[PDB]
Every structure is written in structure tokens, then in C-alpha cells.
């Protein structure tokens, strides 16, 4: 039958991976398009990190449903309010620039 | 004369309104075998025959004496008493369990995931059984080493944070090793679907490798670095 | 009598129980390679926490990144203590970004016997410290 | 009284013992389609044969050429002709399907190069009926053999729908008009006493090295079905042959495997001189164990005993390569460092005779059921059954062979099933007990629980352990043998001072302690004044006062000018002990030894002969 536990954890390594690929090449290269796959990647890694803790802690049926939302509805938002920063505004890697050069 | 203090976890059930309180004794180690257990077995002698616990062969294979002595788990037929007498040796069951009596945990869930995960042999064709030996090379058989030796004492179980939080749906080091112990059984024919077993969010994969589990294994073994041997096959199976 | 029974009639006669719970984390032995479990959730908590603050008030919050900024540099950029807000933002960075990367290591098969847990946790502390010293040098 | 809730229970079959001995029964009536209950006062995997190291007997032939006849030879010749023929033929036949049986449940044998099972040589074993050297056929994983004994049954038994009741004492039979019913229980959990009733029952209850002070098992080896059977009035088998195994540690008196001697390991007195060579030239240290034990002791006594007290022998393996210590014996390595803090590659361990194994027991037929004497003839208990260490078909006779017990325990709890499955059907006339049925083993448990006396629990048992230790020993002699009896009785006598502090329902350990003691008592009665009623040497039981072997012929010589001694002039038979439980008296009895085969044709009786390694 269906193997997606093993598939999810797998992915979760993935994206890990992938974010700590990311973090240096954002560095030496910083454009756009190095802003939104940060943008996906954290949010992403982000949200399956926090889904762990709250599937460890959290105990109960609706009550669990629930945080899953509440966690569901987080991300999405992180995740446009990111994007919308990096359409609309200075963009991920030029604002740690100017945060750091201070 | 030399005099160590002991202090141990209690409860009586059957006492009105008692609640879970340390009782101190002290032992002349002069006159006492160079274990926990034979202290135990001492002031339950000698001091008081309330002291009750589990224990029976004496040498650390039968796994029965297991406690939480002086914040890690082990078994204590088979560590040492410190003979440094301005320590006081501070005794509990094992951490998050329901306590029976003092020191006596039901271990009823423990036994029952072990049995969730068919720990036996498994035949496709079951008809030719008991007729011929099965053939396993000396290096098929090596692979079943640091993984046949468990005990099921629950040490380790019973040190996994997650297995405290979780100790329902998540099967722990203790079982979890043994399913990867029948996993690479070159004799059995069941990987597969010994794998599919575990494809939830909890049987497996609430563990987030903490390896308390391996750090505190009585006999040496390594329950974690197995799970992430079972995490590997997970990730790759094919079916 | 089967595995789920068992499970089943176990939780039934504990709960309706007068039986105590073993004491767990006030009595376990505090080692290093569980401090820097739980530190790695900690951070990972951290972490997302900023980053939730961040975008969302890219949605929620008035005026540019600019804007923001010109009001920090308006609180009196103190040197020392400029360079404390960036230590401060780091250290979990690259403590989890290391603690992260040994993680990955442990899903190899590698690393996982108590000596390579030992050494290679303190080594992991030693990168997070002179990483998160040299990037808020930056 | 009705303090007790008593709950009442119905099966088609009982097993009391969950070693392995008690698996296999339990999950062989299971199979054959019996509702079996199991009782158990220990989670199965605990009991004793975990402990279990050296291995189990079987002529697979995996290393040389061997024969399962070869393999009997051997094990009459080791029961010193107190051995029934007719159960060594049954169980050295089966040995090889049942090693094959659970190599194939899943047992993590030990290899070869030809993927078959690894077998070692072991103390006592030969080829070509004792003329052809040394034999290897004891199977084994690495020297942890029984604790994968047990586990892998364990885990087979898991298969099937057998219900077990865990940590439960058992405290009588259900006995009527002679019939066995049953049996009565504690539930050690919540203080409840549960009636089993059955048509059969099987008793699979282990030994009663804990008679001793200084023995090899565990804490929990208290012989509570050989004191069941007793207080039915039944009687016990050959109590007073009592094994001490050769090499067991100096400190804790844990085993160290007859393996390190079957690998190549050295005994070593205190001059250096390997003495096994002096005692026994043919087989070495790799004789039987009473001789190697017997050997052992006698080199104490004459100074030659090694460390500061004098006091024991050398077991050295630090000639062997370590990579052989490593794989054949990691289990005696690891226990060696452990308790005595001694690294086996570089120094000997030290090592003593102990009690190790009680060949004595419960007598049975070679099918499993219990007999009783009637009439100085033996007939068959309806409904009872016994296996494994606390029976006694004498398979090992007057010594027991290394690995045979392992062996035993698989070949006789499927008897005792197959026993059951053909000669009843599931489903059958349950025979009902009356409703007050066990009311006195509830009596002494109360009284036990309540006792307010003058002598704790633990006094009374080390006075028992200490007087079993100075007075039945390796070597005995009549008068020791006497004064250790009325010692013994005495200390019968000083159970109606006992005092209990525990009051409580719920794990009363205090309590069930105090029922272990009185059945540690009743297997040490019948030991003891059983001990000082032979007058002879014979197997395991040595007397200084009586060095001969007394058979029927001088068997030295050939027997046919010769007259035959009379049953009741000679020792070749089964000792029969009972106990009144009232006063703790012993009488005692005889039996004959059973010489035929199951069949001549294919296994011939070996006749006694003068008997050296
Ligand atoms: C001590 C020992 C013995 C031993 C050995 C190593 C050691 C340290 N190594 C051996 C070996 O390598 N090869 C071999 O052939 N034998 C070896 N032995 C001897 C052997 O282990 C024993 O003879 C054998 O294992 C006895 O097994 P058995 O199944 O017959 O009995 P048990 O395993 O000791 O367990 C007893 C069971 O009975 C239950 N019980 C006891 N009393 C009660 C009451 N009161 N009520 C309910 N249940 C009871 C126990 O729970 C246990 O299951
Ligand atoms: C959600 C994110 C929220 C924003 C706030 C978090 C900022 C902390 C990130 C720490 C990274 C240290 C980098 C130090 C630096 O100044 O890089 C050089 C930068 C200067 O230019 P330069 O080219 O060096 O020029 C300067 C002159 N030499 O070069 C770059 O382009 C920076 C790219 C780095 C990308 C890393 C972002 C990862 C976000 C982690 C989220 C953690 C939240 C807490
Ligand atoms: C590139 C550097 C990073 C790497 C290599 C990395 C890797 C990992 C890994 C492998 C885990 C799994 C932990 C486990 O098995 O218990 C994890 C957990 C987690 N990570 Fe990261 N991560 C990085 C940066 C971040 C960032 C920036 C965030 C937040 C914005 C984050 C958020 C989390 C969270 C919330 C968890 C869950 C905590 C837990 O389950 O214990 N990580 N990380
Ligand atoms: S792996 Fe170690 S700690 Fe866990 S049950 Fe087995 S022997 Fe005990
Ligand atoms: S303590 Fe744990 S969380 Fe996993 S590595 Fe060991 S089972
Ligand atoms: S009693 Fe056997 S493990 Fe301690």
C-alpha cells in the first residue's frame, strides 16, 4: 500500500539539504530568484519542522486537527508575506545586506 | 566498617492515601555483594521486606532487575555500587511508567508492541518447516550481531523522550531494533511488509534521533543506530 | 489475545487507575548529546518564529523595509550592542544550521556510536562559536 | 475465607512454567488445537533458560560424520546406569528434528563454512560408542544459546491463541480422588486467586538450586512444582542427585560455559599443572561433570587451590586466540570482566564447583505423564504432566551430560503435547472440582501473608542455603549426611515461627519469598534424607564412606557365573521420596531403572559397565 510516511521524511531531508544549499549560494549570488527559492525552501522546511513538534505534543483528535490548521494557515501566510516582500520590496538577500552593513 | 546510603522510590497500592516518597536505608558494604541488586537484595533481607522489585538471574540476562539507577537506566545486577560513601545512591523505576508497586512498572504495552511486529521466523512456503536446517553464511549471520543480544529490559524504551510522550503508537528502540533484527535475517521472507508496518507517522518515526536509548543500553547495544538502518530501508524499498 | 487488545486493556486499567506516573526529567542524567537535541528543537522553534514574524508583517505592518530600518538607526546604533543583536541572531542560525548538518550525517548511517556522538558534538559547538563570532563580524 | 475473590477458570490444558521447557508444550497443545492456558511468575522471557550458554545436543553431523545412537551411548554412560533407556532412545532420535525445529522457528545459530549449524565439542561427548574420541554435536549461538532458546520460542509463541497468565504463582495442584484437575493460583498483581481447571496439566517448573548457597541459577529456581507434586502426596524422583557444574564464577557463583572447555579452555591448580591430565588421561577437562567437579574439589582440600583463601581452581582461555574468545565465547568474556574483573585474554578466570542442575524431580514415562508407585509398580497419574528440569524421566540418569538439558526441555515439551493430543480431543469433558477445592493453599497463603513469628523469611532460608552447602556437597559422608537431615528437619520445624512483614494484595514479594521457602524446604527434606539413605558412589551423588558403585552384578566382570543381588540388596534404582507435609517427615521408596530401548533392533541397551573418562 501506500508508502508516505517514509515518502514525507525523505522529502523533509530533501529540502534540508536544500536550504543548506541555498544559504551559501544566496550569499555569493544574491537575485531574485535566489529570494523566492528561500522564500519556498524556509517556509517549507519550516512548516514540516514545526508539523514534528506539534504531532509529538500535541495530544488529541480534534485538537490536533486543529493545530495543523492553525499551522497550515501560519505557513501560507509566512510564505505570501515573503513573497510579496520580494515582488514589492527590497527582497530577502538585499534586506540582510543592509540589516548587516549597520 | 564502611556505611552507604541508599534512597529509594516508593508506593504501596494498597495503602490509603500514600503517595510516591523516598525511603533512605544504609548498608555497610563490608558485608554486601559489589551490585545494586545485592544492596537491594540486602535491605529487603535485613532492613525492611516491603522493598519491592523485580529481579532473577543474578547476572544480566534475564533483564528483569531493570531501574533507573542514579538518572540512567540499567540493570542493577550489573552495575557497581559508587564506593564513595559521601553519595547517596538515589533509586526509581523506570522513567514514565505506570508504577505498580515501587520499582515494579507495567511493562504490558512494552511486551504488547513487541508482539505487534511478529518478532519469529516468516515463510512464503510454511510446508517444508522443521524438516532441514535453513543455510545462513557465517557473514549473513554477522549482520544478526549487537541486534540478537536484547534483553527486553526496556532500558531503553524507557529513556526515549519520545517514547515518554508518545508511548502509545510509538514502538520505541527496544521493539523497533528487533523488527530490524528479523529485517536482515537473511532466513526470513517478510522485509517488505515488516517495512509497510511502520509507514505512520508514529510506530517509527517519532524517533528523532535523541539516542538516549544507545547511550544507556545495559549489554552495549546500539537500538538507534539501528533505527537508522530501518530509516534507510524505509526510504528505499521498492513496491 | 492480541498486540492491539493488550494495548487496549493496558490503557483501560491505568487510567482508571490510582497508579503514579516514574518520574522521567526530573531524575534522567542531563548528557550533551540531549541538551543539543533539545537545543536543535529550540532553535528550529526560534528560527520559524522569526521568519513567521518577518514575512507577516510584510503583509500585516505600514511603510517599507527602509522604513523599519531608519527606525532601529534611530534608536542610537550602539556599537558593542549592534553587534550583540547580531550575535544574537546567528548563534541559533548556525547552531542549528551545524547541529543540522550532523543531523543529516546521522540519517547516512554514520556517527552514531557514543564516542562520534561526543566528538563530533563538540565540534559542532566550536563551528556554531567561531561561525556565529565571524558573521556578526561581517 | 472470601477475603480472596476467587475466579474460576476453564481450558483444555495447563502449563505451569513459561521456560522453555514450558513454551514448547504450551504452543505444541496450542497448535495441535487445544485452548491452553500457560501460568508463569515470571514474563516468560525471564526464566532461567535464558541464562542457558553452552548449548543443545543433536548428531546433526555438521562437523564430522555422527550417528544419534552415538549420542545415546553417551548420555546412559553419563547417567551412570541410573538413566531410562527407553527416554535417552526418544530423545537422542528426535534431537536432530528438534534443533531443526527451531533453527527453523528462527534460532540465530552460530555457522560454518558450510552454512550449517556450528556445533562445538563438550564434556562427555564421543564418537563410535565411546572408541572413536572426542565428538562436536553441541549446537549453539555463540555461548548465549539459551537465551535465544527462549526468546525464539517466545516469539513463536506469539503465533497462537494460548492464554497466558503473567506473573502468576502457582501454589497447588487441583487434585481429586487421585486426578489431577488443575491448579491454583496468586495473581502477584493484584493479590486475586485464580482456580485453572483443565483435563490435563503440565508441570514445567524448573529446579531448586536455591536448596544452596552457592548455586549457578536464578533467584527464582526454588523447585515450586517438585514442592506441588510433594504436598499431593506424590512422589519425587532421585532428589538427592544434585549436579554441581565444574566451572562456575568465584565471586557470584554465575556459570562460565562448559564451552571454554569444549573450545580448547585449560583447568589449572595452583602449581600450573593442567590437572584433568592426572585424573582422567583419555577425556581431560573434558570429562563428565561430576568427575571434573569431583576432581576439582579434591584439589582444594590437598592445598593445591589457587588465590589468597586457597580456596578454587584456574580456568584459563588467554592461550586461545582472541578472535575465538570473541566469537565463540562473548557471552563468558563479558560476565568474566563483569564479576570478577578479569579480562580473559590475558588472565584465567577463576572458577568452583556449584550447583548447577537438578536431574531429579518429578519421575515420568518417556511420554510426560506422571507416575506414581503402587504396589512397588508404576502407574500412570491421570491428568498430570511434567518436563524439563522439575521432571525426572531420568534421561540424565545420575549426571547430566553438558547441552542435554537444552535439549530436554524441546524434546519433552512436545511429548507431553503429542502425549495430550493423542490421547484426548479439545473440547472434552473439563472435570469439575468442588466449589471449595484449594481452600488450604489459600489457608497457608493467608497464614504466610499474616505471620507474625519469631524468624524472618531470609534468616530461615540462608540457615537452609548454609546446612544444604556444609552438608550435602560434592563428597558425603553418612554421619555429615545425618546431622545435615535433622538440621534440615529442624528447620521444618522453624516454618511455624516464620514472620512476614508485608500485609499487602498488591506484589507481595515478602509473601510469595515465604511460599518459595516452603517449597525450597520440601525439595531440601527429600534431598537430603534421600542423600544419607544411599550407600553408594553413583554418578553426582559421592560417598566417602560407600566408594563403590552397588548395582545388581560386579559388572566389571563378565556376570554369568554370577548371582544376581536381590531389588532390595543393591542401588542400581530410582530413589521415590515423599513427604508428610504436616511434620516434615520423609519416607522413602524404590523404583527399577528402565534398560530396554523403544526398540532393540534399532538402539541397543547398553548394560552397566565400569564407568571413566
Ligand atoms: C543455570 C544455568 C543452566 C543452564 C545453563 C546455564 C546456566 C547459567 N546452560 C545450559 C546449556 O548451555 N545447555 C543445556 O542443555 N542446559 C543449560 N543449563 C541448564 C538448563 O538451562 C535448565 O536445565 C533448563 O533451562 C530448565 O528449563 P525449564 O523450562 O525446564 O525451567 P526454567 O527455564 O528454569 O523456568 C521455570 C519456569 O517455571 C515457572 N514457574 C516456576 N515456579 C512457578 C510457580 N510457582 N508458579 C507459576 N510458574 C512458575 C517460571 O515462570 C519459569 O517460566
Ligand atoms: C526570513 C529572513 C528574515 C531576515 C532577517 C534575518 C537576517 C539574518 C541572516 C544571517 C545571515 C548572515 C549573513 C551576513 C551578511 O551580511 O551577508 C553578506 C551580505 C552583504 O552583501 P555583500 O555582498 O557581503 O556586500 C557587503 C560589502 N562587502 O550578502 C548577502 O547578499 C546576504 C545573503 C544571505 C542570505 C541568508 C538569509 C537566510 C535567512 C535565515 C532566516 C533566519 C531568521 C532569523
Ligand atoms: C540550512 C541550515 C538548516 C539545516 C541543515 C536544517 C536541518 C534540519 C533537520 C535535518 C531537522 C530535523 C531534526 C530532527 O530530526 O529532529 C531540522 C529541524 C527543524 N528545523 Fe531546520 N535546518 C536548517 C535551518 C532551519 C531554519 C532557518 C529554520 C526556521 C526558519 C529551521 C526550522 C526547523 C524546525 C522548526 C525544526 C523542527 C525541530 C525538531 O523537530 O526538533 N531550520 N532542521
Ligand atoms: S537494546 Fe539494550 S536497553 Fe534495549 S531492551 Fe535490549 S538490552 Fe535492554
Ligand atoms: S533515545 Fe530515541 S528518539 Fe530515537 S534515537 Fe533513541 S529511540
Ligand atoms: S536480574 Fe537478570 S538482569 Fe538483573
Same mark, same amino acid.
Given at each position: ?34 529570494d523566492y527559492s528561500l522564500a519556498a525552501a524556509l517556509t517549507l522546511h519550516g512548516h514540516w519542522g514545526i508539523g514534528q513538534v506539534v504531532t509529538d505534543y500535541v495530544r488529541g483528535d480534534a485538537l490536533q486537527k486543529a493545530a495543523k490548521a492553525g499551522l497550515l494557515a501560519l505557513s501560507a501566510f509566512t510564505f505570501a508575506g515573503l513573497c510579496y516582500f520580494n515582488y514589492h520590496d527590497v527582497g530577502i538577500c538585499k534586506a540582510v545586506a543592509m540589516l548587516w552593513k549597520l | 566498617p564502611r556505611i552507604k546510603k541508599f534512597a529509594i522510590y516508593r508506593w504501596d497500592p494498597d495503602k490509603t492515601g500514600d503517595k510516591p516518597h523516598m525511603q533512605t536505608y544504609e548498608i555497610d558494604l563490608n558485608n554486601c555483594g559489589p551490585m545494586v541488586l545485592d544492596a537491594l537484595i540486602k535491605i529487603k533481607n535485613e532492613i525492611d521486606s516491603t522493598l519491592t522489585f523485580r529481579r532473577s538471574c543474578r547476572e544480566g540476562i534475564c533483564g528483569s532487575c531493570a531501574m533507573n539507577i542514579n538518572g540512567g537506566n540499567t540493570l542493577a545486577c550489573t552495575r557497581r555500587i559508587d564506593t564513595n560513601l559521601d553519595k547517596v545512591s538515589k533509586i526509581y523505576p523506570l522513567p514514565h511508567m505506570y508504577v505498580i508497586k515501587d520499582l515494579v512498572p507495567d511493562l504490558s504495552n512494552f511486551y504488547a508492541q513487541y508482539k505487534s511486529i511478529e518478532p519469529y521466523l516468516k515463510k512464503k512456503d510454511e510446508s517444508q518447516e522443521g524438516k532441514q536446517q535453513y543455510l545462513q553464511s557465517i557473514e549473513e549471520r554477522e549482520k544478526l550481531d549487537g541486534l540478537y543480544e536484547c534483553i527486553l529490559c526496556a532500558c531503553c524504551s524507557t529513556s526515549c523522550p519520545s517514547y515518554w510522550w508518545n508511548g502509545d503508537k510509538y514502538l520505541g528502540p527496544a521493539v523497533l531494533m528487533q523488527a530490524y ?6 532466513? #526470513? #521472507? ?19 534521533? $535523541? ?15 539501528? $533505527?537508522?538502518?530501518?530509516? /534507510?530501508?524505509?526510504?528505499?524499498? /521498492?513496491? | ?10 490503557? @483501560?486499567?491505568?487510567?482508571?487507575? @490510582?497508579?503514579?506516573?516514574? %518520574? ?37 505592518? %505600514?511603510? @517599507? ?33 551545524? @547541529? ?14 557514543? %564516542? ?23 | ?393 531420568? &534421561? ?115 509473601? &510469595? ?72 517427615? &520423609? ?27
Amino acid at each position: 500500500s501506500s508508502k508516505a510516511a517514509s515518502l514525507h521524511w525523505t522529502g523533509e531531508r530533501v529540502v534540508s539539504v536544500l536550504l543548506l544549499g541555498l544559504l551559501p549560494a544566496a550569499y555569493l549570488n544574491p537575485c531574485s530568484a535566489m529570494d523566492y527559492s528561500l522564500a519556498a525552501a524556509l517556509t517549507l522546511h519550516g512548516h514540516w519542522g514545526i508539523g514534528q513538534v506539534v504531532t509529538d505534543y500535541v495530544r488529541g483528535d480534534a485538537l490536533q486537527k486543529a493545530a495543523k490548521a492553525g499551522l497550515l494557515a501560519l505557513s501560507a501566510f509566512t510564505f505570501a508575506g515573503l513573497c510579496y516582500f520580494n515582488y514589492h520590496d527590497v527582497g530577502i538577500c538585499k534586506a540582510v545586506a543592509m540589516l548587516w552593513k549597520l | 566498617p564502611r556505611i552507604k546510603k541508599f534512597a529509594i522510590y516508593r508506593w504501596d497500592p494498597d495503602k490509603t492515601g500514600d503517595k510516591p516518597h523516598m525511603q533512605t536505608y544504609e548498608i555497610d558494604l563490608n558485608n554486601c555483594g559489589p551490585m545494586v541488586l545485592d544492596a537491594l537484595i540486602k535491605i529487603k533481607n535485613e532492613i525492611d521486606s516491603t522493598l519491592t522489585f523485580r529481579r532473577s538471574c543474578r547476572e544480566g540476562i534475564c533483564g528483569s532487575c531493570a531501574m533507573n539507577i542514579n538518572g540512567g537506566n540499567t540493570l542493577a545486577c550489573t552495575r557497581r555500587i559508587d564506593t564513595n560513601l559521601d553519595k547517596v545512591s538515589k533509586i526509581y523505576p523506570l522513567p514514565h511508567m505506570y508504577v505498580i508497586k515501587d520499582l515494579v512498572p507495567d511493562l504490558s504495552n512494552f511486551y504488547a508492541q513487541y508482539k505487534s511486529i511478529e518478532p519469529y521466523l516468516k515463510k512464503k512456503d510454511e510446508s517444508q518447516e522443521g524438516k532441514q536446517q535453513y543455510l545462513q553464511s557465517i557473514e549473513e549471520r554477522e549482520k544478526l550481531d549487537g541486534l540478537y543480544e536484547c534483553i527486553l529490559c526496556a532500558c531503553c524504551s524507557t529513556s526515549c523522550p519520545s517514547y515518554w510522550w508518545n508511548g502509545d503508537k510509538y514502538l520505541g528502540p527496544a521493539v523497533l531494533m528487533q523488527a530490524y533484527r528479523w529485517m536482515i535475517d537473511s532466513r #526470513d #521472507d517478510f522485509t517488505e511488509e515488516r517495512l509497510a508496518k511502520l509507514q505512520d507517522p508514529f510506530s517509527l518515526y517519532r524517533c528523532h534521533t $535523541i539516542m538516549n536509548c544507545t547511550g544507556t543500553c545495559p549489554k552495549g547495544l546500539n537500538p538507534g543506530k539501528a $533505527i537508522a538502518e530501518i530509516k /534507510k530501508m524505509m526510504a528505499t524499498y /521498492k513496491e | 489475545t492480541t498486540a492491539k487488545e493488550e494495548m487496549e486493556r493496558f490503557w @483501560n486499567k491505568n487510567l482508571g487507575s @490510582n497508579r503514579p506516573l516514574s %518520574p522521567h526529567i526530573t531524575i534522567y542524567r542531563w548528557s550533551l548529546p540531549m541538551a543539543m537535541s533539545i537545543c536543535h528543537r529550540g532553535t528550529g522553534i526560534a528560527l520559524s518564529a522569526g521568519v513567521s514574524l518577518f514575512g507577516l508583517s510584510a503583509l500585516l505592518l %505600514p511603510g @517599507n523595509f527602509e522604513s523599519h530600518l531608519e527606525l532601529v538607526k534611530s534608536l542610537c546604533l550602539g556599537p558593542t550592542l549592534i553587534y550583540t543583536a547580531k550575535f544574537g541572531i546567528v548563534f541559533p542560525l548556525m547552531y542549528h544550521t551545524w @547541529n543540522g548538518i550532523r543531523h543529516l550525517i546521522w540519517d547516512l548511517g554514520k556517527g552514531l556510536t557514543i %564516542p562520534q556522538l561526543t566528538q563530533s558534538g563538540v565540534v559542532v559547538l566550536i563551528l556554531t562559536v567561531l561561525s556565529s563570532v565571524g558573521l556578526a563580524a561581517m | 475465607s472470601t477475603q480472596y475473590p476467587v475466579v474460576d477458570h476453564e481450558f483444555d490444558a495447563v502449563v505451569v512454567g513459561a521456560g522453555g521447557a514450558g513454551l514448547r508444550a504450551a504452543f505444541g497443545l496450542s497448535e495441535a488445537g487445544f485452548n491452553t492456558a500457560c501460568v508463569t511468575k515470571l514474563f516468560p522471557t525471564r526464566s532461567h533458560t535464558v541464562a542457558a550458554q553452552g548449548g543443545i545436543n543433536a548428531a546433526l553431523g555438521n562437523m564430522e560424520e555422527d550417528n544419534w545412537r552415538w549420542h545415546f551411548y553417551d548420555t546412559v554412560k553419563g547417567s551412570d546406569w541410573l538413566g531410562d533407556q527407553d527416554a535417552i532412545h526418544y530423545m537422542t532420535e528426535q534431537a536432530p528434528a528438534s534443533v531443526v525445529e527451531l533453527e527453523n522457528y528462527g534460532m540465530p545459530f552460530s555457522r560454518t563454512e558450510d552454512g550449517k549449524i556450528y556445533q562445538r565439542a563438550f564434556g562427555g561427548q564421543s564418537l563410535k560408542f565411546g572408541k572413536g574420541g572426542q565428538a562436536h554435536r553441541c549446537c549453539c549461538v555463540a555461548d548465549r544459546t539459551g537465551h535465544s532458546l527462549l526468546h525464539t520460542l517466545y516469539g513463536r509463541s506469539l503465533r497462537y491463541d494460548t492464554s497466558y497468565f503473567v506473573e502468576y504463582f502457582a501454589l497447588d495442584l487441583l487434585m481429586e480422588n487421585g486426578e489431577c484437575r488443575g491448579v491454583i493460583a496468586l495473581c502477584i498483581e493484584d493479590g486475586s486467586i485464580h482456580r485453572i481447571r483443565a483435563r490435563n496439566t503440565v508441570v514445567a517448573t524448573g529446579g531448586y538450586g536455591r536448596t544452596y548457597f552457592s548455586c549457578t541459577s536464578a533467584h527464582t529456581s526454588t523447585g515450586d512444582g517438585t514442592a506441588m507434586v510433594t504436598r499431593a502426596g506424590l512422589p519425587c524422583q532421585d532428589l538427592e542427585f544434585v549436579q554441581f557444574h565444574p566451572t562456575g564464577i568465584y565471586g557470584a557463583g554465575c556459570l562460565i560455559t562448559e564451552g571454554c572447555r569444549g573450545e580448547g579452555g585449560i583447568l589449572i591448580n595452583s602449581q600450573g599443572e593442567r590437572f584433568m591430565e592426572r585424573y582422567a588421561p583419555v577425556a581431560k577437562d573434558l570429562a563428565s561433570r561430576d568427575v571434573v567437579s569431583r576432581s576439582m574439589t579434591l584439589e582444594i582440600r590437598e592445598g593445591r587451590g589457587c588465590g589468597p583463601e586457597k580456596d578454587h581452581v584456574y580456568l584459563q582461555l588467554h592461550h586461545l586466540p582472541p578472535e575465538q574468545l570473541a566469537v565463540r565465547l562473548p557471552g563468558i568474556s563479558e560476565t568474566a570482566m563483569i564479576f570478577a574483573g578479569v579480562d580473559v585474554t590475558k588472565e584465567p578466570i577463576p572458577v568452583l564447583p556449584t550447583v548447577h542442575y537438578n536431574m531429579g524431580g518429578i519421575p515420568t514415562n518417556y511420554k510426560g505423564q506422571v507416575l506414581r508407585h503402587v504396589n512397588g509398580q508404576d502407574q500412570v497419574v491421570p491428568g498430570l504432566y511434567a518436563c524439563g528440569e522439575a521432571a525426572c524421566a531420568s &534421561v540424565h540418569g545420575a549426571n547430566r551430560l553438558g547441552a542435554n538439558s537444552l535439549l530436554d526441555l524441546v524434546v519433552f515439551g512436545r511429548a507431553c503435547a503429542l502425549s495430550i493430543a493423542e490421547s484426548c480431543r479439545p473440547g472434552d469433558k473439563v472435570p469439575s472440582i468442588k466449589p471449595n477445592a484449594g481452600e488450604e493453599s489459600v489457608m497457608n497463603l493467608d497464614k504466610l501473608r499474616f505471620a507474625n513469628g519469631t524468624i524472618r523469611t531470609s534468616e530461615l532460608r540462608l540457615s537452609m542455603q548454609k546446612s544444604m552447602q556444609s552438608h550435602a556437597a560434592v563428597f558425603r559422608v553418612g554421619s555429615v549426611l545425618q546431622e545435615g537431615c535433622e538440621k534440615i528437619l529442624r528447620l521444618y520445624g522453624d516454618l511455624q515461627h516464620l514472620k512476614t512483614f508485608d500485609r499487602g494484595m498488591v506484589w507481595n514479594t515478602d509473601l &510469595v519469598e515465604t511460599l518459595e521457602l516452603q517449597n525450597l524446604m520440601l525439595c531440601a527434606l527429600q534431598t537430603i534424607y534421600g542423600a544419607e539413605a544411599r550407600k553408594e558412589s553413583r554418578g553426582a551423588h559421592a560417598r566417602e564412606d560407600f566408594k563403590e558403585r552397588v548395582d545388581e552384578y560386579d559388572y566389571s566382570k563378565p556376570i554369568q557365573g554370577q548371582q544376581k543381588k536381590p531389588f532390595q540388596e543393591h542401588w542400581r534404582k530410582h530413589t521415590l521420596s515423599y513427604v508428610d507435609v504436616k511434620t516434615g517427615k &520423609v519416607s522413602l521408596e524404590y523404583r527399577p531403572v528402565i534398560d530396554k530401548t523403544l526398540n532393540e533392533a534399532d538402539c541397543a541397551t547398553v548394560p552397566p559397565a565400569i564407568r571413566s573418562y
